[PDB]
């Protein structure tokens, strides 16, 4: 049957400010999925797993 389950909200990141870009600071204690995609024609989708 379906039901509702809880999941962690991992440590959200600190965001820098970069010229025509951005640099991030991800923190984790366990493997976690991350990804992003553009908002125009070229999706330029990317995904990754981060351990620490």
């Amino acid at each position: 049957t379906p039901t509702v389950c809880p999941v962690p909200l991992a440590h959200t990141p600190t965001v820098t400010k970069w010229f025509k870009g951005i640099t991030l600071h991800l923190t984790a204690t366990r493997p976690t999925l991350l990804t992003t995609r553009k908002l125009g024609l070229r999706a330029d989708a990317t995904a990754e797993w981060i351990t620490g």
């Binding site: 400010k17 970069w18 010229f19 025509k20 951005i22």
Partner: protein
């Protein structure tokens, strides 16, 4: 869009542009007036708004 009017009053307006050259014409009521000036790029350069 609009504002309260007055016999001789004055107002301040907000706007945005795609160029730093603020040369254009703007219409109030049915009349219009020109507006020329120079705008500078900002310091912050990363926003999703």
């Amino acid at each position: 869009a609009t504002t309260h009017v007055t016999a001789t009053g004055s107002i301040t307006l907000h706007f945005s542009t795609s160029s730093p050259q603020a040369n254009f014409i703007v219409s109030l009521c049915g009349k219009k007036t020109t507006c020329n000036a120079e705008c500078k790029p900002p310091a912050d350069h990363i926003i999703g708004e």
